[PDB]
Amino acid sequence: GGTILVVTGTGTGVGKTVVCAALASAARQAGIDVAVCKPVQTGTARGDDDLAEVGRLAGVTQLAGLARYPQPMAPAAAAEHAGMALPARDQIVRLIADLDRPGRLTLVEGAGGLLVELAEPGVTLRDVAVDVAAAALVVVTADLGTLNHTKLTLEALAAQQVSCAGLVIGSWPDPPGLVAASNRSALARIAMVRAALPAGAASLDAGDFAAMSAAAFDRNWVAGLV
Amino acid sequence: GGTILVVTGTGTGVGKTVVCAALASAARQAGIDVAVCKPVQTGTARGDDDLAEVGRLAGVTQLAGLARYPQPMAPAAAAEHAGMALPARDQIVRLIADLDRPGRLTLVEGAGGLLVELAEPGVTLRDVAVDVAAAALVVVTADLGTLNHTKLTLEALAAQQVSCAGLVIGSWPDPPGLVAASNRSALARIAMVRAALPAGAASLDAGDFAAMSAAAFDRNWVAGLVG
Numbered sequence: 319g320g321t322i323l324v325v326t327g328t329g330t331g332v333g334k335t336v337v338c339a340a341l342a343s344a345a346r347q348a349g350i351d352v353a354v355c356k357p358v359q360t361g362t363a364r365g366d367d368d369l370a371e372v373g374r375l376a377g378v379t380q381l382a383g384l385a386r387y388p389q390p391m392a393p394a395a396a397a398e399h400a401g402m403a404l405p406a407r408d409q410i411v412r413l414i415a416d417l418d419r420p421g422r423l424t425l426v427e428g429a430g431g432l433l434v435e436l437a438e439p440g441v442t443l444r445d446v447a448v449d450v451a452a453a454a455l456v457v458v459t460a461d462l463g464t465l466n467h468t469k470l471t472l473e474a475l476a477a478q479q480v481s482c483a484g485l486v487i488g489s490w491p492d493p494p495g496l497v498a499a500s501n502r503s504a505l506a507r508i509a510m511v512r513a514a515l516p517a518g519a520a521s522l523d524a525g526d527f528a529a530m531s532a533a534a535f536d537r538n539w540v541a542g543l544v
Numbered sequence: 545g546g547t548i549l550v551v552t553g554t555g556t557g558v559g560k561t562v563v564c565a566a567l568a569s570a571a572r573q574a575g576i577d578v579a580v581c582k583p584v585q586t587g588t589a590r591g592d593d594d595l596a597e598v599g600r601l602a603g604v605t606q607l608a609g610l611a612r613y614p615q616p617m618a619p620a621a622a623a624e625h626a627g628m629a630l631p632a633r634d635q636i637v638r639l640i641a642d643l644d645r646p647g648r649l650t651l652v653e654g655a656g657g658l659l660v661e662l663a664e665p666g667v668t669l670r671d672v673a674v675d676v677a678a679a680a681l682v683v684v685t686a687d688l689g690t691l692n693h694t695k696l697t698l699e700a701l702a703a704q705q706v707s708c709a710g711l712v713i714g715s716w717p718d719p720p721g722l723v724a725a726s727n728r729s730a731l732a733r734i735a736m737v738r739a740a741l742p743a744g745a746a747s748l749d750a751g752d753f754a755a756m757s758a759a760a761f762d763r764n765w766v767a768g769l770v771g
């Protein structure tokens with residue numbers, strides 16, 4: 319086996335996908351082979367496609383997914399509106415296990431937050447992280463309310479003995495602002511802050527995004543992941 | 545004592561204050577003595593004052609505060625920015641204990657979400673709820689992301705054996721879109737939804753607000769809150 323990380327977020331729209339891309343880009347530039355699994359993708363009718371974004375921004379080609387739902391809703395909700403079930407727990411765990419190989423960083427991107435139902439019946443990304451012995455990287459905001467949401471997510475991880483690999487602020491504003499500066503310091507008291515991605519980074523071309531990502535993370539930490 | 549309910553939320557801006565006012569108004573109209581307590585208030589320099597809004601919307605005069613900090617931030621940062629300290633645990637507990645009495649419903653309004661630090665060191669509303677044997681009413685939104693936030697908050701309450709008194713949707717759109725309708729159904733499968741306050745409730749006058757409040761909750765639930 320290699321290294322499996324689940325990438326979750328404290329909520330929706332926190333920048334999980336740009337963080338997957340930035341970490342993928344950083345890790346490739348560190349010579350690591352990277353796969354990204356997005357088992358469940360919703361919001362396709364309006365053009366959401368997180369794997370494609372990871373492809374454009376970081377050049378990853380091992381991009382695996384199982385299901386795509388048009389409605390911009392939580393999977394269970396999108397799957398009910400569509401009249402079709404979610405994938406099986408079995409499918410998700412085994413797709414991830416087959417992606418994973420020595421020398422490879424495999425990132426598993428949830429949909430929304432940690433306790434959204436990903437597979438039938440009621441199985442979450444937390445359940446999947448247990449099954450594949452993955453640690454969890456938590457994407458957070460620097461905005462008002464982030465400390466509570468982060469602490470809640472970390473408690474939920476520890477309740478099932480899922481290790482936390484750190485936090486990433488998905489969007490760092492410019493200029494920061496009083497709240498954002500305060501929250502960054504407080505977040506670092508609760509866990510390791512691996513990066514804070516400049517606001518607007520998702521609009522970069524691949525070259526600029528690759529330079530941003532290399533500077534965003536600690537090179538030694540990245541190298542140590544595998 | 546009487547009944548103590550802490551009123552928390554899945555985050556900030558979910559409508560805890562209007563929910564406190566609405567439940568207070570419904571209980572008063574059922575003949576229940578109501579006090580509302582806000583042990584930590586931030587944002588006072590921008591005019592934030594939840595107790596005064598409760599009084600204005602619901603007519604409550606039994607209102608009790610404790611700590612007030614100027615900046616509209618989490619209490620620890622707001623207190624640091626003002627060169628002040630957070631209250632001690634027993635200052636919060638004594639405030640609640642002094643209000644509590646038989647026949648009375650005492651609502652304790654949190655600051656932000658459940659695990660926000662209210663007192664040194666790392667004391668949260670969840671700890672306070674344990675100390676005063678209160679159940680927790682959880683205020684939620686109907687928007688994308690509420691299910692995860694609600695489940696995280698209920699799991700945290702259960703981790704300390706704090707009973708969940710149910711959910712209240714702080715702002716309910718009319719008409720409800722597909723997403724809000726779907727989230728309300730999912731929310732009700734997680735826990736009892738005690739009310740869904742109409743959007744804009746905070747702008748109703750006293751009589752409209754009182755009428756909205758009486759219709760918002762099951763009267764048998766409200767009446768049963770206090771023996």
Ligand SMILES: COc1ccccc1C(=O)[C@@H]1CCC[C@H]1C(C(=O)O)C(=O)O
Pocket residue numbers: 329330331334335360361366368389390391392393428429430431434688689690
């Ligand atoms: C399933 O998770 C959710 C939970 C609650 C609310 C919304 C969602 C979403 O799916 C959003 C909506 C479409 C895009 C998705 C987005 C992404 O593609 O990154 C995300 O994961 O938040």
Ligand SMILES: COc1ccccc1C(=O)[C@@H]1CCC[C@H]1C(C(=O)O)C(=O)O
Pocket residue numbers: 462463464555556557560561585586587592593594615616617618619654655656657660
């Ligand atoms: C202090 O706790 C917090 C922690 C994190 C984020 C926000 C808050 C707030 O308190 C907000 C900020 C000002 C108004 C407050 C509001 C209310 O007065 O109703 C609330 O309590 O959420």
